[PDB]
Amino acid sequence: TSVEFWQNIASGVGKWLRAIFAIAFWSSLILLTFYAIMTQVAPSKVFRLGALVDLIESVKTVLLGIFVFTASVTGIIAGVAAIANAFGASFAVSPIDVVNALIFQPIVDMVK
Amino acid sequence: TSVEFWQNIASGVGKWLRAIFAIAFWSSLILLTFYAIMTQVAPSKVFRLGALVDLIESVKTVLLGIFVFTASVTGIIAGVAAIANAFGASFAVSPIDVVNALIFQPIVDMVK
Amino acid sequence: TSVEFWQNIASGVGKWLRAIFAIAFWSSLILLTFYAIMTQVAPSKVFRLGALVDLIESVKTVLLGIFVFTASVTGIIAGVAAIANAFGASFAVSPIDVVNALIFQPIVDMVK
Amino acid sequence: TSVEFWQNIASGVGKWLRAIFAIAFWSSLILLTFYAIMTQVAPSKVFRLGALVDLIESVKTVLLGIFVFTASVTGIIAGVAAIANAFGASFAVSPIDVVNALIFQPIVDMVK
Amino acid sequence: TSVEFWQNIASGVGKWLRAIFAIAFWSSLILLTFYAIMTQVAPSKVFRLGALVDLIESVKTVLLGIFVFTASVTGIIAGVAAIANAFGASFAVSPIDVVNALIFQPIVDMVK
Amino acid sequence: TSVEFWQNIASGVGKWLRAIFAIAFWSSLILLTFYAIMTQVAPSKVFRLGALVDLIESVKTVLLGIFVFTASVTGIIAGVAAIANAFGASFAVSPIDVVNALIFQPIVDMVK
Amino acid sequence: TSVEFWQNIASGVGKWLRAIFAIAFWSSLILLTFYAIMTQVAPSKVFRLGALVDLIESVKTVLLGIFVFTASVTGIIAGVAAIANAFGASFAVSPIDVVNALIFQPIVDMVK
Amino acid sequence: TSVEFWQNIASGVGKWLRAIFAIAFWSSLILLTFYAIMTQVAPSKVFRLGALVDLIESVKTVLLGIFVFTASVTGIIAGVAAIANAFGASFAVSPIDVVNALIFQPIVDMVK
Amino acid sequence: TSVEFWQNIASGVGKWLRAIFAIAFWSSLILLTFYAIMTQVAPSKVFRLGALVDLIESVKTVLLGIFVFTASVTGIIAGVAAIANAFGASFAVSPIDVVNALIFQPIVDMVK
Amino acid sequence: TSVEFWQNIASGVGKWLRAIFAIAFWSSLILLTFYAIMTQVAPSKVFRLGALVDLIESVKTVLLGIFVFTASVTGIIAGVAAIANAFGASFAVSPIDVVNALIFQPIVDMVK
C-alpha cells in the first residue's frame, strides 16, 4: 500500500531474525555445555568418549555453519560490487559494514 | 513471540546448566571419596588395589573431561575471532571472560 | 457436500488424535518404566549403565518433543494474532485457551 | 480402531510392567540373600571376602537404580509442570501422586 | 494384457511372501537358539551375560515386530471399513478373516 | 528361488543347532567332571577349595542359562498366542509341544 | 564413445574387483590367524577368552557374508530367469556358471 | 594400484604371522620350562604346589587355544565347501592342505 | 553489446571456475587428511573404525566424481565430433586437448 | 572474491592440519608411554597385564591408521593418474612427492 509500511515490516523482521540468530549461537554454546556435563557424569568410559566425540562434532558444525554464512554474505555483496563493473556502474555499499552488521554485531552484545 | 522471552529462557537454562555442572564436578569429588573409603575398608588386598586403580581412573577421566571442555570453549571462541579476520570484520568479545565465566566461575563459589 | 459434515469429521479426527497423543505420552512413561526394570535386572554393570543412559535419553527426548510441540502451537497462534496487526484486523482467539486445550487438557485426565 | 481399546491395552501393559518391576526388586533382595549364604558357606576366606564385596556391589547398584528411576520420574513430571509455565498453561497433575503410584505402590504390597 | 494374468502373478507373489515370512519367524526362533548355545558355551561370565541380554533383545524385537505388523493390518482394514461409513457405502470384508490369513495362517502350519 | 529349498535349509540348520546344543550341555557336564578331578587331585587345600567354588559356579551358570532359554521360548510363544487375542485371531500352535521339542527333546536322547 | 571401450573398462574393473575380493577373503583368514596368536600369547585368561570369542565372531561373520553374497547372486540370476517366464521370453544364461565364476573361481586359485 | 602388489603384501604378512605364531608356541613351551624351574627351586612347599598348578594351567590353555584355532580353520573351510553345495557350485580347495599349511607347517620346522 | 565483451567475460568466468575446481579437489584431499587425524585420535575403537569407513567413502566419491566429469566432457566432445559425420561436416577440435585443459591442467600446477 | 584469497586460506588450513596430525602421532606415542608407566606401577598383576594388552592395542591401532591413511592417499593419486589414461590425458603429478609431503614430511621434523 505504501513504501514505509514495507520498510518497517522488513526492518522489524530483520532485527527479529538477527536477534534469534544470536540466541541460536548461544544455544549452540549451551549445547556444548550439556555435552560437557554428559561426559563429566556419564558412568561408563564409552559414554564419556562418545560425548567427547559429539562435543567435537557440535563445535565443528557450528564453526562450519558460521563460516558458510559469513562467506556467503561476503560473496553475494562482493559479487554485486564486481558486477557493477564491466558496465561502468558504481556500487558504493561498503561491504565490510554490512558483513559486520549482519553477522557479528548481534552476537557480540550478549552476556551469558 | 517476543525477544526478551527467548532471552530470559536462554539465560535461565544457562544458569541452571552451569549450576548442575558444578554439582557434577563436586559429585566426581565425592565419588573419589567413595573409592577412598572403599580402598580403606575393603578386606582383601586385591579389592583395595582395584579401588586404587579405579580411583586413579576417575581422577584421570575427570581431568580429561575438564580439559576437553575448556579446550573446546577456547577453540570455538578463538575460531570465530580468527574467522572474523580475512574479511575485515571486528569480533571484540574478550574470549578470556567467556571461557572464565562458562567454565570456572560456577565451580569456584562452592563449599563442600 | 455440506458444512456440518466436514465439521463433524474434523472434530472427530481431532479428538481421536489428541486421545492417541495422550496415550503416546503415557507410553513414553511406560517405556521409562521398562528401562527402569532393565537397569534393575541387567546382570552386568555395563548393561545397567547403558540402561541408565538410554533412560536419560528417553526422558530428554520426550521433554524436548513436548517443548517443541507447545512452542510451535504458541508460535503459530501468536504469529496469526500479530499478523492481524499492521492491517487493523482484530483476532480475538484467546491463544492461551487453545494452547491449553490442544496440549495439556487430554494429558491431565488420565490415570495409570 | 477405537479409543478404549488402546486405553485398555496401555493400562494392562502398565500394570504388568509395574508388577514385574516389584518382582525384580524382590529378586534383587533374594540375590542379596544368595550372596549372604555364599559368604556364609564359602570355605576359603578369600571367597567369603569376595562374596561380601559383591554383596555390597549389589546393594549399591539396586539403590542407585531405584534413585535414578524415581529421580527421572520426578524430573519428567516437574519439567512438564514447569514448561506449562512461561505460556500461561495450567498443568494440575499432582506429581506426588504419580511418582508414588508408579514407583512405591507396587513394591509395598508384597510379602516375602 | 489380461486380468487373470495379473491375478495369478499377485496371488503367486503373495503366497511366496507369506511363506518366506513364516520362514523368517522360525529363523528368528533359530537365532534365539543360537544365542542360547552361545550363553551356554561362552567361557567367561561376561560373554554369557551379554548373550542373555541380546537374547532378550531378540525376543523383544521379534515380539514388537509381530505386534506392529498385526496392528497395522488391523488398522488399515478397520480404517477402510470405517471410511465406508459417513458415505453410506457398505464394506463387508470380514477383517478378522484377512488379518488371520495374512498373519497367523502361514505361521501355524510349520514344524521345526 | 523356491519355497521347499528354504524349508530344507531351515530344517537342516535347526536340527544341526539343536544337536550341537545338546553336545554343549553334555560338554558343560564334562567340564563339571574336569573340575571334580581337579578338586580331587589338587595338592594344596586352597586349590581344591577354589575348584569346588568354580564347580558351583559352573553348575549355577548352566542352570541359569537353561532357565533363561526355556523361559524365553515360553515367553515368545505365549506372547504371540496372547497377541492373537484382542484382535479375534486364532493361534493354535500348542506352545507346550514346541517348548518341549526345541529344548528337551534333543537333550534326552543322549548317553554319556 | 564406442562399445568395446566400455566393454574393456567393465571387464577390467570386474577382474580387479574379484581379485581384491579373493584378497579380502584371505585377509579374513589372516585376521583369524592374528586372533589365534592373540589367544595363544595373551597373558591373562580373560584376554585369551575374549580372543576366542572374537575369533568365533570373525569366522561367523565371514561365513554369513559369503552366504549372503552367493545367495544374492543366485537370487538375482534366478529371478531374471523366472521373470523371463510368464512372457514367453527365453533366458538361457546358465546361472550355475555365473554364480561359480563370480564367487568361487577367484578364491580357489590362491595359495597362502 | 595393481594386483600383484596386494598379492605380495598379503603373502608377506601371512608368512610373518605364521612365523611369529610358531615363535609364540615355542614361547609357551619356554614358559612351561620357567614354571618347571620355579617349582624346582621354590623354597616353600606351597609355592612349588602353586607352580605345579599354574604349569598345568599353562599346558591346558595352550592345548585349548591350539584346538580352537585348528577347529575354527577346519570349520570355516568346510563351511564354505558345504555352502558351495545347494547351489551346484564346485569348491575344490582341498581343506586338508590349507589346514595343514596354516597350522602345523610353520610349527614343525623349528628346533629349540 | 560487443563480441569481445562476451568473450572476455566468458574467459574470466571459465578460468575462475577451473581454479576453484582445483581448490575443491585439494579441499577433498584436506578432508581426507581430517578424517585421517580423526581416526588417529578418536579414543574408542568404534569411532576410529567409522572414520576409516567414511575416509573410504570420501575417496570413493571423489574418484567417482572425477570419473563422471572427465567421461562427460569426453562424451560431449566425441558426440559432437561424430554428429559432424553423417552430414559431411568437418569438426577438427582435437578433443584430447580440450579434455586435458578443462580437467587436468588446473589441477596439476598446485602444491600443498 | 579472488583466487589467491582461496589459495591462501587452503594453504593455511592444510599446513595447520598436517602440523596437528604430527602432534596427534606424537600424542599417540605419549599415550604409549602412559600405558608403559601404568604397567610399570600398577600394583596387581592383572592390571599390569591389562595395561600391556591395551598398550599392544594402541600400537596396533596407530599402525593400522597410518597404513590406511597412506594407502588411501596413494590410492586416490594413482587412481586419478590411471583414469587420465583410456582418454589420452596426461597427469604428471609425481604421486611419490605428494604422498611423501602429505604423510611423512610433517612427522619427521619433530623432536620429543
Numbering used by the authors:
A (entry chain S), B (entry chain O), C (entry chain R), D (entry chain N), E (entry chain Q), F (entry chain M), ...: 38 to 149
How did the manuscript describe this experimental structure?
Here, we determine atomic structures by cryo-electron microscopy of three conjugative pili, two from hyperthermophilic archaea (Aeropyrum pernix and Pyrobaculum calidifontis) and one encoded by the Ti plasmid of the bacterium Agrobacterium tumefaciens, and show that the archaeal pili are homologous to bacterial mating pili. With structures for four bacterial conjugation pili (pED208, F, pKpQIL, and pTiC58 from A. tumefaciens) and two archaeal ones (A. pernix and P. calidifontis), it is clear that there is a common architecture for all and obvious homology, despite negligible sequence similarity. Each prokaryotic pilin subunit consists of two or three hydrophobic α-helices, with kinks appearing in some of the helices, such as in A. pernix and A. tumefaciens. Hence, pore diameters of all prokaryotic conjugative pili are sufficiently wide for the passage of ssDNA, but not dsDNA.
Cryo-EM analysis of the P. calidifontis filament preparation revealed pili, which following the reconstruction to 4.0 Å resolution, proved to be structurally similar to the CedA1 pili of A. pernix. While in the A. pernix filament the helical rise and twist per subunit were 3.6 Å and 76.5°, respectively, in the P. calidifontis filament these parameters were 5.0 Å and 74.2°. From the secondary structure and side-chain information present, we were able to determine the pilin identity directly from the cryo-EM map using DeepTracer-ID39 to be P. calidifontis protein Pcal_0765 (WP_011849449), which we name TedC (see below). Although TedC displays a similar fold to CedA1 from A. pernix, the two pilins are processed differently, with A. pernix pilin not being processed and the P. calidifontis pilin, similar to bacterial plasmid conjugative pilins, undergoing proteolytic cleavage. Notably, however, the mature P. calidifontis pilin contains an additional hydrophobic α-helix (α3) compared to pilins encoded by A. pernix and bacterial plasmids. In P. calidifontis the extended density could only be explained by a bipolar cyclic tetraether lipid. The cryo-EM map was good enough to identify the cyclic lipid as a glycerol dialkyl glycerol tetraether species (GDGT), a dominant membrane lipid in many hyperthermophilic archaea, including Pyrobaculum species, and we have modeled the simplest form, GDGT-0, into the cryo-EM density. Most of the pilin-lipid interaction network in the P. calidifontis pilus relies extensively on contacts with helix α1 in the asymmetric unit (ASU), but the lipid is sandwiched between α1 and α2 of a subunit in the neighboring ASU. Thus, the protein-lipid interaction stabilization relies heavily on hydrophobic interactions for P. calidifontis.
